[PDB]
From a paper:
The autosomal dominant monogenetic disease neurofibromatosis type 1 (NF1) affects approximately one in 3,000 individuals and is caused by mutations in the NF1 tumour suppressor gene, leading to dysfunction in the protein neurofibromin (Nf1). As a GTPase-activating protein (GAP), its primary function is suppression of the Ras signalling cascade by accelerating the GTP hydrolysis rate of Ras, which returns Ras to its inactive GDP bound form. The ubiquitous Nf1 isoform-2 splice variant Nf1-23a (2839aa) is, together with Nf1 isoform 1, which lacks the 23a insertion (2818aa), one of the two biologically relevant alternative Nf1 isoforms.
In the closed state, additional contacts between the last helix α63 of the GRD and the core bury another ~240 Å2 of surface. The linker between GRD and the Sec14-PH domain is in the closed conformation part of a Zn binding site, contributing a stabilising contact to the N-HEAT/ARM core. The closed conformation of native Nf1 is stabilized by a cysteine- and histidine-coordinated transition metal binding site between the N-HEAT/ARM domain and the GRD-Sec14-PH linker L2 and is formed by the triade C1032, H1558 and H1576, with the fourth coordination partner a solvent accessible water molecule. In the closed protomer conformation, access to the hydrophobic core of the Sec14-PH domain that, in the X-ray models, harbours a phosphatidylethanolamine representing a membrane lipid component, is largely blocked by the GRD. In closed conformation, the GRD arginine finger R1276, critical for Ras binding, is not accessible. The 63-nucleotide exon 23a inserts 21 amino acids into the Nf1 GRD between residues Q1370 and V1371, extending helix α56 by one turn before it loops back into helix α57, with residues A1380 to R1396 remaining disordered at the lysine-rich loop apex.
Residue numbers in the entry:
A (entry chain F): 483 to 620, 674 to 795, 831 to 853, 887 to 1121, 1134 to 1379, 1398 to 1953
B (entry chain N): 1954 to 2458, 2601 to 2745
Amino acid sequence: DLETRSYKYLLLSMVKLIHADPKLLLCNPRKQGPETQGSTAELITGLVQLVPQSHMPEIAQEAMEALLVLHQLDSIDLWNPDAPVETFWEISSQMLFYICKKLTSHQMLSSTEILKWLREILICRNKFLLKNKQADRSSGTPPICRQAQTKLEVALYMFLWNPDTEAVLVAMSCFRHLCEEADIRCGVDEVSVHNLLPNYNTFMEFASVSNMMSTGRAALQKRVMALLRRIEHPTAGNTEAWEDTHAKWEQATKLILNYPTDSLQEWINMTGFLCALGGVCLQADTPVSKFMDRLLSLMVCNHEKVGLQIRTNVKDLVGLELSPALYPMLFNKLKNTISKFFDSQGQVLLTDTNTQFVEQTIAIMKNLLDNHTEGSSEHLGQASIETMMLNLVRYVRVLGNMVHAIQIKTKLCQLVEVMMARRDDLSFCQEMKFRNKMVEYLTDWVMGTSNQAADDDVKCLTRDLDQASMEAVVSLLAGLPLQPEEGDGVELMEAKSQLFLKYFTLFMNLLNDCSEVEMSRRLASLRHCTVLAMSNLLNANVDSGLMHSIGLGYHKDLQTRATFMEVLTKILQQGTEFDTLAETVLADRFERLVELVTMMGDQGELPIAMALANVVPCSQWDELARVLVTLFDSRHLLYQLLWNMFSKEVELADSMQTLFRGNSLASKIMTFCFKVYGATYLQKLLDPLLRIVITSSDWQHVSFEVDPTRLEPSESLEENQRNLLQMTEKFFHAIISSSSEFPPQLRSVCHCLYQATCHSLLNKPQNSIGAVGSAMFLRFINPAIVSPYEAGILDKKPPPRIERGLKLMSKILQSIANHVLFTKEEHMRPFNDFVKSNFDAARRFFLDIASDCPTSDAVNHSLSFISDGNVLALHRLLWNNQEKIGQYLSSNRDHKAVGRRPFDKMATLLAYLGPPEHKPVADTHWSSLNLTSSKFEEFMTRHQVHEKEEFKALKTLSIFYQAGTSKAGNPIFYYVARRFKTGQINGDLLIYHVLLTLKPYYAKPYEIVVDLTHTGPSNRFKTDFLSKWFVVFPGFAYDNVSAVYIYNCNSWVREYTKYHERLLTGLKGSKRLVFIDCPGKLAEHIEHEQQKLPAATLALEEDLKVFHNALKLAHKDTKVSIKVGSTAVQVTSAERTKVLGQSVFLNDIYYASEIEEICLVDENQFTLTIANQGTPLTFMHQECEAIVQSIIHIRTRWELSQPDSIPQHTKIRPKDVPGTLLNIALLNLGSSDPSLRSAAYNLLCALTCTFNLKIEGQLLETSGLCIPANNTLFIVSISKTLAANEPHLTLEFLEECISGFSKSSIELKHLCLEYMTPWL
Amino acid sequence: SNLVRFCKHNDDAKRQRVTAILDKLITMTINEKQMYPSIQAKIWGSLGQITDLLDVVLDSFIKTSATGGLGSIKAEVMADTAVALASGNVKLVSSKVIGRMCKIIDKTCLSPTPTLEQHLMWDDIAILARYMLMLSFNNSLDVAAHLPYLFHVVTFLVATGPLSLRASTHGLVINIIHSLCTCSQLHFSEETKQVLRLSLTEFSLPKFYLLFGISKVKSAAVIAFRSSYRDRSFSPGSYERETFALTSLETVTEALLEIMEACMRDIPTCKWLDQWTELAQRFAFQYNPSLQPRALVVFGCISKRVSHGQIKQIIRILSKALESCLKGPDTYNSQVLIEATVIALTKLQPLLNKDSPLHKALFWVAVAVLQLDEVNLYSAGTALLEQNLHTLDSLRIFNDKSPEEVFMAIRNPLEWHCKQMDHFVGLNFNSNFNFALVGHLLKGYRHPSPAIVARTVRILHTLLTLVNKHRNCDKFEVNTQSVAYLAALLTVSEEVRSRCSLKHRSNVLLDEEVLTDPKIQALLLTVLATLVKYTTDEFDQRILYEYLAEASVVFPKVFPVVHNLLDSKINTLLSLCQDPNLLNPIHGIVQSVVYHEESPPQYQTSYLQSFGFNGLWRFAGPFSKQTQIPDYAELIVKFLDALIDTYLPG
Ligand SMILES: CCCCCCCCCCCCCCCCCC(=O)O[C@@H](COC(=O)CCCCCCCCCCCCCCC)COP(=O)(O)OCCN
Ligand SMILES: [Zn+2]
């Protein structure tokens, strides 16, 4: 009994003796025997095994102090005087390896106490490393040092989720000592600090948060899980801490569930931790995939004991905490689980579990989409959320009616509203076909006056359900053209009008019930929404729904009438066609906007840009970067922006280079600059060299390897070394020579950095060029060389043996910039000789670019392009953040009144322009700056475009088909402009089809002929979709364009080119562009009997009578030759026109069926108005009736050909009814509601300018005018003057005036008499 | 259509008949609501085209409206009827409704009243205002000839009256600008028309809705007009009426002036600006407690020339306002005639002769106002001081002399009056100028408005850059002259804190090599104590206590004159403070006191009263809630009178 107790007392005393003096027991070392361990090692192992005992807490406490005295600098030498810097690391490292594995193994009572001692040991061993490195670097890193460095990290992560607050706070602090050791081992930051410890930058943040006030575990976990979400680079420590704690989590779950609060709180912490850091372990059956399924099988956890709390928390975490790198996997699993609810034949099955699982799937999606977090945007694009949403409504659709199921419907309606605020972030395969269906399904649930029939006030919630539904429908309809499902063939035009009438009546019926005479806030809000819904419906599609809406002019609600005219006013100001109407009206209207943004703040302050930077949320930093760079370049002030933006970042953080490579608003500016302009420069330069190494037989097969371990005996080392050096010279010489070809933009970019560092040096033999040269080369030139295939330079991935040479080439080249010889790199030391000569040469290349004038007074390019597309986004951005940007301006600028300073100017102008218009829909898939030919090909290949059955349709349409060969023998392709509709099909599938056909042959030179016969605005490419063609293709194929032939061009095409000139400037004066002025030329250059132009085009054949020397009377007269074809009329101009610097003759073609109007005003000249062409076409011929006779003959023949011409019309546009609108304006300009009159005056202003009406006074459109009530003589002088000057409107005006007489009241009836008489 | 002859029938009592006929027609319009659109076109539309008959017809409208009242149905309808009448002769009805407005206002002098709403003729103005509102649209008020007279009346109505009449004045302005853009008599170039359209937008921003006093109103038009104006009379309520601030009228009066100048560039030999000036100048120098304050803030904002004779009147209208305040119990009435005098002077100084003595004598008027302890006067007082220094620089008066030399030189002739003022206020300017001009500027930190706190900081910066430049000492050197301005900027300016750092963490404040005078180092400690007695902020107390702990050791002998100021607050901090950062400096103070306390005190607490500065700590206190004249202003009245006599003999 006491004998055992005696030993403990003796053992405790001995340990304290070592604490007092460690040299007493360290004298006369035994030294490590070849077959036995030494004496100092055996002593340490004895003390270590007492720390985690917990059977003898007093001894364990002392053992910590004893081992902490043997680590002081004084006592380190005594371990082994023979070699003090080799035995230490071996002994000390194994101590960490033993102890760390114990903490991870399981929880211990003193777990929070061993950690405080373990921190000190790290501090001590850092000190001994510092001095040893100082004295002699020679410091060794045996496998144990690596095998124990890992396990140290694996034991600092799994402590982050420990429940005790003190443990986690200490653990975060211990990351400093893990980083500070990195600097000692390698002074140079980039080489090792970001290579030995890849996630070095994030670790530094742990320290800052730890130095913060203590708070409950819930508050702390939020910051901890945030930091764990930014671990970008996988590492052995990360990839093993996730799995080690995954096993504990899985088994812990079984105990909680199987058993029929502290236990739960531990479970919650492990889950939150285990998700935020999931992204590292990413990359079929896998540990990560098994985590999700087990997670989803808990959202429906029905457990009487603790079921409620589990579901309440899994919803909270998966929503607000998941790592943005796991969204693409969450959706896929989520969609499949839903898909198995609809059995074959599409009948929903209600099991009361799926009901619970959909009610959760709605809450998870809402939180996930609602939160804007860093990096989320890049990942949302990959997945397609369409198919899941549609299936989701169907299940809720059949759920039935009850107090419970109504609440589910409510939230589902709220989700769709949040899902339409991120529509730009998400990706849609078919937006139109999807957004229409949701409108179809949702309108069903809107039922008014159903709570009175139900006779239960408990179901007042139905008022909320109707209130919620409209809010969703309003967001959906913003910019949505209607499209009917092609269940039957009833003609497209007639189907849409029928569809429009279906919705308009629905809203109108709902509108009458909301009348107050027939809760006031409820009706006030609901009525307000139901009117905004109609406004969005009309704007998108006026042609098919303007007639159905005219009845709103005389509505019974004066408020409703007021709104209708406001929306009606906007339509007139917009242009029915392109009309160069934004080129004039929008260009001038938004001209001032850039001047405000480009406000040259004194001494380069630029308050608008600088202020806009900080205030804008980080999510849109992508959009903000592109807009600023593009805009300032147009103004020739790019240098100014860079100096201001970089200076704050560089001066703020002396580590200038490091931050720029890091993620931030300033950083992203560089990325855009290099990528947008660099791409062309790199590919043009590197490409010729790549052919030589990859394909030339002279190079044949050789290994660019000098690794003795991998060195193959077959090849001589000398041969490889000399060849690799010779190849490097080829690349190096090319880079230095091509100094001129450097784009101006980067030249300016380098200068600003040069001035920044040079100014940075002044305040602080470092060479500014040295840092610049290494920086530019490392981030711009180096990446392309290593992997040209990914950059898109090379179609096919280089063979691995060729790949190795490029990799080694980069290292040699990079060393030249730093003027660093090969240290501990004997592998490449023989090459060190070569770099010596080229050190001076590299300097010259850097200086030339860095020698550009700080102010480019001499270097000038006054391009001053309009940049129409960019401006719209800029105005859109300002409107959203109008308030918040003001607050930033408000804080400063007190020295001078802001009346002449940004905030005053911003508010005035921004209000003046009014709200921005809604964005149009997107035909193409979601795409971002990070796009290249390799990326596009992989994405489409992974998609199953082959069997879509819409890809197949392109084959039938015969668009871009290969046709035989040419005189030179090159294959020919024919692209048909007619066959492509603007939006009816996704625009990416067209590119994939074209790319697929050209892939086999585009390597060799090829000739392409494009047929633009009968081109119209219907078949067109938008600005955004057009840009992809320049980038999607690999790029080397562009050079293989042997020749281009254009046939049957028309004026409309020329007009398009003028508007999109900037993008097509590259093709300006293009040698490859050859224009077929007449049919008799193409057959000569092309192989006759091989050309396969469209049969329909040839069917016209231009084989009818020619009325030579007909003159097109217009603003300018151009001789036009008219051919009256059998089925159409072709107008061929006889005067050459300049298109892209090449002369050509335009040949407009008018199909006979399209000839609605044929008026022969006189034998000298005839009138030919055509559908939606505005002013008719007038020409002069000596015998007009001879021509018109045939045209009437042609049209009359078609009338017989067509099945039913009598059914037509029932379609109108604002230009068609000048009279009708004039009536409602005048009638409502005397109403009794003050607001209504103000709207009427504005409508009159926007109606007297579009149609160039002549009135006596001048009218200006504004808001807020206070008009007098007695407007009984003003509208009796406007009416009189118009009738005198514009009599032709009599028939239109008089008919409508009568129709409003009946609807108006007694008091207004007398007014109609007053201004009606002058017209008779 | 035949009453032309009868209206001037030799006053044979037949003229009395036509007015009965006209009065009968007016009653038909009020009752026959359904036939309204047809009566206006026939009866009034045609009857208003007889020039000779306009004068009598228009007169009858005013009488009918008068009886009903401001919101009565009868008066409301005649306003609409006037629109049709004016279509025939815009040039005659417009120039006759305006002529009555300008004459009613000019008769308010006979029986002055504290406010317009309390004047007897208030109703006559109110109804006449609605006529101008309706006639504003579509240029039925001839702007091309009456623009001067319309702005003149706009300024006297902004933000006065019931919420209906306040929304009307906003509508009136929005229509006058609109008529300018769409008038054919004037030929505005395409450059000018851009200016007008931007101004048209500004007045509809929520910034100006506050200035006119109709904030919390979504739209002005809706309130201005009432739909059921024929059936029932207006029903005003919520008699609570916001206040009006003479600084707001500056923004309005300067926004309008911008529009007028733009037009004057095109119209050759225009007379608008000279007609507007005369109207303002007539009310400026005439006693009317209801219009004089508003007519002075407008005279200064627009005038282009000022003479000695005019300046004497402005400074002697300030003399009488002070006298009235103390004599009678009506204070707020006459506390706005002073705040308006200072704002006027703030605008007219840079137009002076450039060599008059008054360019320098307006530095003691600014000082004499800060001594009255009122938030509104104090805010207006600094605005004069800030610009007075700015003006003198452009005239290069500080080239070879120091502020003390300049301002103290023009104070010698009337020193006898000044000396007594310094005795009571508890500050002296002869003993130490650079510290007396800083007690007055230490109260600014206690102002509620965060926009005046910035102004005082800027004022200190400019004074600092002027004393050093006289010595050519880098603008931040520490000397006897430039030490008061560094203690004041210590807690707000980073450059002063960094460039002058505490030794016991360039040069360090509290240097004993240069600060070797007991008097110049006794003041420097009360300034630091003063800033902490009233300040309440962790960052401010931290920095100021660290500089006091070091003061205990560097200046052991003079430190005990700062006990009573620190006595009360320190005692509480020791008991309850729980801040390691803020508790360290306090302990260092306690230890130093006991160590130094071993000999008779060289200087008692009353050492400052010996040479004048006994009231420095009181003058930096918070603004009194019980707003009252300090009652020693009886000397400021005598001081000002001597100033006029000495430099403006006549
Ligand atoms: C890059 C092409 C841009 C224009 C594309 C227009 C859209 C139709 C193109 C034809 C459809 C079939 C696929 C064609 C793929 C190959 C295009 C090609 O050869 O591109 C090169 C040559 O381009 C051409 O020859 C295109 C000539 C097209 C016809 C002339 C333009 C006006 C008429 C067509 C307008 C668009 C269609 C009708 C709607 C307005 C570009 O040379 P680069 O040096 O600029 O390369 C980029 C390096 N950074
Ligand atoms: Zn797709």
